[PDB]
Every structure is written in structure tokens, then in C-alpha cells.
Amino acid sequence: GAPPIMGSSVYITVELAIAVLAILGNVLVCWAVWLNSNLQNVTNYFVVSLAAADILVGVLAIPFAITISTGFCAACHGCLFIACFVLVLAQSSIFSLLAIAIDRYIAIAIPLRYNGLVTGTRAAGIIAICWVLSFAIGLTPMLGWNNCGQPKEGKAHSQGCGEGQVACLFEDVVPMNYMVYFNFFACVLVPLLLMLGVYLRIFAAARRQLADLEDNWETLNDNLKVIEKADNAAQVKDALTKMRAAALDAQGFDILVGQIDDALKLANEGKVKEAQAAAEQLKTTRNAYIQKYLERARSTLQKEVHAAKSAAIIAGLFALCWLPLHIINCFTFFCPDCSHAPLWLMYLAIVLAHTNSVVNPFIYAYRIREFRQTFRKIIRS
Amino acid sequence: GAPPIMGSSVYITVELAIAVLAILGNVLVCWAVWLNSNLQNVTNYFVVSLAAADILVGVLAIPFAITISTGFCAACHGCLFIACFVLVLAQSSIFSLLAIAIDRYIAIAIPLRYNGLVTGTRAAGIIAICWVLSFAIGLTPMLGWNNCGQPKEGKAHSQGCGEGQVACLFEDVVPMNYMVYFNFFACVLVPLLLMLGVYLRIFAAARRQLADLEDNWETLNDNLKVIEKADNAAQVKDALTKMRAAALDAQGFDILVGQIDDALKLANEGKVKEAQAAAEQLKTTRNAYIQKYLERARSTLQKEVHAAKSAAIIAGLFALCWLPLHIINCFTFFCPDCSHAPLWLMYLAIVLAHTNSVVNPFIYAYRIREFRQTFRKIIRS
Ligand SMILES: CC(C)CCC[C@@H](C)[C@H]1CC[C@H]2[C@@H]3CC=C4C[C@@H](O)CC[C@]4(C)[C@H]3CC[C@]12C
Ligand SMILES: CC(C)CCC[C@@H](C)[C@H]1CC[C@H]2[C@@H]3CC=C4C[C@@H](O)CC[C@]4(C)[C@H]3CC[C@]12C
Ligand SMILES: N#Cc1c(N)nc(SCc2ncc[nH]2)c(C#N)c1-c1ccccc1
Ligand SMILES: N#Cc1c(N)nc(SCc2ncc[nH]2)c(C#N)c1-c1ccccc1
Ligand code: NA
Ligand code: NA
């Protein structure tokens, strides 16, 4: 049984190292968005809300975690504030991650109405609502769902606490049924599962749109071959009618549709050879115009998929960092006779959850050019 | 390719956290030995030499590691000093660990001559020799075994280095054949293997001595039973002669040997019943005296085994922390075409080796009462 200040010196130093990084990296995220007008869009306002939560993890949650780990004497409700504040930040993070996923789904599924649906001032209103909701969720124990009515009086007397005070220990004041059913299952697990569903729908929408672009491109080229190897005017007409509906479906295009109409008129006059010659002109338009549109549309979809993968990595890292702590609480709660969860593992799980506040600035720097470039310029300046 | 200052900010913060802990813990080790005269013995003078090396890891090696990781412009030999200084500390640690193992072997194998062989002033002389040898081993590259004759001129010109300067990078100035054959195989691996051999001999010596104590105890009790179930004076004499040689072998004992002689005289006179009655008196002496010696001797051996296990854990942790770095160097050296050792893994291996400077104060606190108690009193004061 080595002096408690030794093992806790490792814990405290690790916590403070994480706080330094959480503050530095996320201040840099906010700074980049403030300076670069190319980074000022709705998606990045939620990115700023998420970085603000991570800055408060370093400034407030980590000092609070170090404090409550001592078990210092405190009035139960004051204790309950420094125990639960991290839950407010985690909840705010969940709401920002969920909003980012929904923003990306609107952008890929209905890009025509994105600008009119997703407004900068509406994003600020959603963020405000989400922060107020997060306070209500994270601080629900202070509203009455707590163990303040059944204080551990033996622990309070041992530590020489005053009347009306308890030894401030997280597990003594925050109910385990709140942590597992309310915080984990309802407020963390359900939103993360919803996020997963949204990301699946984003990638499936992108996969289908790319297939539809290639399907229309193939239909155009295949029907040109059908016209070349046709012997009757009815066969030329059949392929041209299918090409015309496909050209409007994919909507340079004025020349294309006009040239299809020119050949269709010749086909209807029974001039097969003349219709096939008119259809050959379509190849020049396809090369000079249509292929450029196809390649630009494909490149736009790939950029959207790349941005959605970056956002999903951010969400995936939140799940990876927070799940161990939640899972440990599930074992403590659901298996009361399980000899499990040593204190070193509980501190490792807490340290891992705090680590999530360090990782997002790295993901933006490694995956997003505009962020990476702005970070270089801020470090230079 | 995120800005280099970001990933290196994680590395630097982790290195500085380790330096804080290496200094704090090992200052506490030195403080305890200085204050408590129960901790002032030869074994703990080597413990202080090992803690002094760990304090210099925090004060000098870690700031040097951070510095050379930038690749700053430097005169090749100056570069070679801040590259190799950590090797001096690692070598000094190896010598202290080896001395601690040899000290414990002398204590268990020849406890009668330990005080006369192992002197405090001789320990200070060995430590002095070991530190001078460590400087020669660790700084052998500065004596000429270096890549200063073949500077990477393209790297020096790129960084705008002056004439006579190189980009200070460990792998550019310290030869890989020095690191693998000389530093690893000869100066690290051979001494660690020697340490393992010494620890095996310590535990085998302890195991044999405990078996010899129980063998003499069993021989005493079994021969008492032989005397009780004897019918002739020759049988009583045979068991008493074996008991007498065993009593001197285990050397209260004056009473025991005298009572054996009393019964032996009766046996030689052909007085069987009288000899068996005289031998029954041995039981009172065995209970009042001999069993107390047996239990104290057994308890002393168990304390020595416990102390040797603690010292072996210290050595085992050095091997566990330093081996990954050495093994990575072996892959780089022996397999030049092996696409291996990413830079994040090289930093993880360096961070793990530095971590070894933090762990020893914890092992003493968790395993050694006199250290643990002194640490409490230093923290109280
Ligand atoms: C994607 C979702 C479903 C993953 C979230 C993790 C949850 C639902 C799972 C994963 C492992 C599960 C635990 C596995 C082991 C036990 C021990 C048993 O005595 C009580 C239930 C308990 C404690 C389970 C509770 C629920 C649990 C924590
Ligand atoms: C107890 C002692 C023997 C353990 C010390 C580790 C040393 C001797 C061993 C363990 C794993 C070994 C390495 C395993 C793989 C390779 C790849 C091969 O292409 C070159 C040799 C090399 C690089 C070996 C060199 C020696 C090595 C590093
Ligand atoms: N779940 C849980 C939990 C806990 N069971 N304990 C503590 S603090 C005392 C402690 N740390 C290690 C051992 N004992 C904390 C804190 N902060 C938490 C916690 C909860 C949510 C978010 C972040 C952390
Ligand atoms: N072996 C090796 C080694 C190395 N190959 N490089 C570096 S420093 C640049 C670096 N760190 C990460 C990537 N690149 C260092 C240092 N210090 C060492 C080293 C050697 C002995 C002891 C402790 C560390
Ligand atoms: Na967060
Ligand atoms: Na060391």
C-alpha cells in the first residue's frame, strides 16, 4: 500500500498533460474557423461547438476529475456539480456529432435545397438549444436523481467532514442506474446508433448516385453502338428515344438534345443512313461537353464522400474513447457480485475518455486541407 | 501531412510529463536513503546510483531527446554528445542493476563473510568506476565511431546549416552497427543475461537452504521415532550418532548435544530402556529451543527471497522497457530492405524506455516497508 499521493501523481500528471493538449489543439480549431472565411459554414459551426466542449474539458472537467478523485469534504449538491459537469460536455459533444451527421446527409441527399434549409443563424439556434438540453441531461442528478438522501456517514465522519457535508466521491453521489440507463443507454448509445444509421444512409446515397452517373453514361454509349448496328429506321428511333430521356435525366446538353432530335426527325422520315450519320455527331458533343460534366459530377461526389468519412472518423473515435468507461459501469451495475473493475483500470478508462478531447484537431489537420493550411499559417504567425 | 509541430506537441508533452515524474520519484528515493539510517547500506548505495541516473534522464536526457528530434543545425561532435548522453545513463543503470544482483548473491550464498567483503566505501569506489566506464561506453561514438566523416550534405544545405555543421539527427550521426553490436549485444544484452544467471543462482541457493533446514528438522524427528521403536542398544546408538552429526550440522544446541551424549553413553552401556528415556528429554529441548531457531532461520531466508524478488522485478522492468527500442534497431540494421518501424512506433519505443525512469520509486514503495514508511514521512513533512 504505497502512499496515495504517488499513484495519484501519475494520474494527475497524465490528466494535466491531456488538459494542455485539449486546450491548445481546440483553441487552434476555433482560431482557424474565425480567421478563414472558407471554413465559415454551418458544418464548421458545429465543429466549433464541439471544440468549445473540448476546451472546457481541459479548463474545467479535468481539474474537476482530479478534485473529486481526492474525496474532499463538500456539500452534496456542490459535489454533484463537479461530478456531473463532464456529462454536460459529453452530451453537448453527442449533439454536435449528431448535427454534423445530419448536416452531411442533407448535403448529399438534397443538395438543391441545402442552402435554403441549412442556415448559419439556424445552426446557432440549434447549438443554443443543444447546449441548454445538454445541461439538463448532464445535470439531471442535481435535479433530484442522486444519492444525497443516503450519505455514507461513516465515510463523512472518517474524513472529519462538517454537518451537511459528504466525502465527495463520484460513485457515492451519482446513481449507477442514472449512469447506465439514462446517461449511457438513452443519451449516449441511442444517439450514437442514430449517427451510425445516418452515416450508412449518407454512404449508400453517395454509392447510388455514382452508380446512376455511370449508368447514364453507359446508356449513352451503348445506344450509340445500337444506332450504328441498326438496319431499320424503327431500331434507330428506339435507341434515340431512350438516349433523349437519359439526356434529360442527366440534366452542352442543349447541343446533345438538339442533335438527338435532329436524328430522330430523320429516323421518322425513314432515312436510316442519314439518321446514323446525324447520330455520329453526338460523339463530338459527348467528348467536348458531356464527359467533362460526368467527371466534375463524379469528382464532387468523391469530395463529399471524403468529407463524410472524416466526420464519421470523428464520431467513431468518440465511441471508441467513451465506450470502455460506459461498459465498465455496465459491469458494476448489472453484475453486483462481479469481482471486477480495479481502480487502475477505472483511471485508465477516465484518461481514455478525456483523450477524446485531444484527437479531433489532429483528424482535421490530417484529413482537411483548408484546416491543415490555416493551422500552418497560425503557427507561422 | 499535418504541421510537424502538432504531432511533436504530443511527443514533447509526454516527454515532459515523464521528466516530471522521473525527477520527483527519484529525488524521493535519494531523500529517503539520506534521512533513514536503516536504508543506509551497500545495496541502497547502488539504488541511489540508479536513482541519480534516472534523475539525469529527466533533467538532461529527455530535454536532449526533444532537442535532437527537431534535427537542429549543430557541429557534428556536439550533436553526438546530445545524441549519446542517454546511453551513458542506460549503461550506468545496467552496472547498478548488475551490482545489486551480485550484492544479493553474496548475501545469500556467503552471509558469514558478507559484512567483511561488502563495504560501504568499496561500494562508493565501484560506483565511481562504473560511472567512468559508463561514460566511455556511452560516448564511444564521440571517440571516432560515428558518421561525422560522411555528413548528409543535402540535409545540411536544406536546413541552412553553417560550414562544419550537420542536421542533428540521431540516426545520421550514431552508427547502427555501434547501436546493435556494441551497445545492445555487448553492453546491454550480455549484462542482462548475466543478471538473469545471478538471479537464478540466488533463488536456487535460497531454495536449497530452506530444503536443508527442513531436512535437518525431519532427520531430528524421524530419528527420535526410530529410538522409541528400537529393541536393541545398537539401534538406539545408530539413530543417536546420526542425530548428533545433524545437530552440529544445524549449528539450546548445547543442551541438545549434551542430551544426545547422555543417551549415547547409556546406549554404549547396553541400557536400552534408560537410553530411550534419556532420548525423550530431547523433545522438550526441541520444542523450547530448536523449533524457535528453525522458524527464525526460515523467516530470515523468506525475507531474503522477498528482497531478491523485488530487485529482480526492477531488473525485469529495465529489460521490458529497453528491449523494444533495441529490437527495432535490430530490424532496421539486420533487414535493410524491411519496410518497417514507422516514426510513431519509434517515438513510442523511446517514450517506453524513458518510462523506466519513473517506475523504480513505485516498486520500492509497493514492495519495501522501510522505503514506503520513509516516503510517507517525507510527504507529511
Ligand atoms: C453497440 C452496442 C450494443 C454496444 C454497447 C455495449 C453494451 C450494450 C454491452 C456490451 C457488453 C455487455 C455486458 C457484457 C457482460 C455483462 C455481465 C453480466 O453479468 C451483466 C451484463 C453485462 C454487464 C453486459 C451489459 C451490456 C454490455 C455492456
Ligand atoms: C533474450 C535475447 C536473445 C532477446 C534479445 C532480442 C534479439 C536477440 C532478437 C529477438 C528478435 C530478433 C530479430 C527477429 C527478426 C529479424 C528480421 C531478420 O530479417 C533479421 C534479424 C532480426 C532483426 C532478428 C535479430 C535478433 C532479434 C532482435
Ligand atoms: N463512470 C464513471 C466515473 C467514476 N465511476 N468515477 C469517477 S471519479 C473517482 C475515480 N476515478 C477512478 C477511480 N475512481 C468519474 C470521474 N470523473 C467517473 C466519470 C463519469 C463520467 C465521465 C467521466 C468520468
Ligand atoms: N535507437 C535509437 C534512437 C533513434 N533511432 N532515434 C532517436 S531521436 C529521433 C527520433 N525519435 C523518433 C523518431 N526519430 C533516439 C533518441 N533520443 C534514439 C535513442 C537511442 C538510445 C536511447 C534512447 C533513444
Ligand atoms: Na468531446
Ligand atoms: Na534507468
Tab-separated table of C-alpha atoms and ligand atoms in Angstrom, chain A residues 11 15 61 64-66 68-69 82-83 86-87 169-171 176 179 183 322 325-326 329 343 346-347 350 353-354, ligand 3:
chain	number	residue	atom	x	y	z
A	11	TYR	CA	-2.862	10.168	-12.686
A	15	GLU	CA	-4.636	14.426	-16.669
A	61	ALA	CA	-13.675	18.842	-16.425
A	64	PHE	CA	-12.843	18.702	-11.527
A	65	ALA	CA	-11.852	14.990	-12.143
A	66	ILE	CA	-8.605	15.483	-10.235
A	68	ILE	CA	-13.316	14.608	-6.877
A	69	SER	CA	-10.674	11.767	-7.005
A	82	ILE	CA	-18.180	18.895	-10.048
A	83	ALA	CA	-19.127	15.188	-10.516
A	86	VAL	CA	-18.239	16.311	-17.638
A	87	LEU	CA	-21.582	14.691	-18.545
A	169	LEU	CA	-16.732	10.686	-4.460
A	170	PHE	CA	-18.383	10.272	-7.882
A	171	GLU	CA	-19.766	6.782	-7.292
A	176	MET	CA	-25.400	3.927	-11.085
A	179	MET	CA	-25.253	6.370	-15.375
A	183	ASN	CA	-26.739	8.559	-19.455
A	322	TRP	CA	-16.149	6.696	-24.267
A	325	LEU	CA	-15.971	3.741	-19.325
A	326	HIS	CA	-19.633	3.036	-20.075
A	329	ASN	CA	-20.214	0.949	-15.460
A	343	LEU	CA	-9.031	1.221	-9.661
A	346	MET	CA	-11.116	2.842	-13.846
A	347	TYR	CA	-8.438	5.618	-14.084
A	350	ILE	CA	-11.305	8.004	-17.465
A	353	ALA	CA	-12.380	9.332	-22.332
A	354	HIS	CA	-10.541	12.632	-21.664
C	3	LIG	N1	-18.484	6.350	-14.754
C	3	LIG	C1	-17.782	6.890	-14.054
C	3	LIG	C2	-16.843	7.658	-13.136
C	3	LIG	C3	-16.464	7.087	-11.943
C	3	LIG	N2	-17.027	5.786	-11.649
C	3	LIG	N3	-15.666	7.699	-11.082
C	3	LIG	C4	-15.158	8.887	-11.379
C	3	LIG	S1	-14.050	9.770	-10.241
C	3	LIG	C5	-13.248	8.714	-8.987
C	3	LIG	C6	-12.406	7.578	-9.581
C	3	LIG	N4	-11.650	7.614	-10.695
C	3	LIG	C7	-11.113	6.415	-10.849
C	3	LIG	C8	-11.493	5.635	-9.804
C	3	LIG	N5	-12.286	6.353	-9.052
C	3	LIG	C9	-15.501	9.534	-12.557
C	3	LIG	C10	-14.944	10.934	-12.822
C	3	LIG	N6	-14.534	11.968	-13.020
C	3	LIG	C11	-16.375	8.925	-13.451
C	3	LIG	C12	-16.751	9.579	-14.777
C	3	LIG	C13	-18.059	9.538	-15.224
C	3	LIG	C14	-18.382	10.091	-16.446
C	3	LIG	C15	-17.407	10.713	-17.205
C	3	LIG	C16	-16.101	10.772	-16.759
C	3	LIG	C17	-15.773	10.175	-15.557
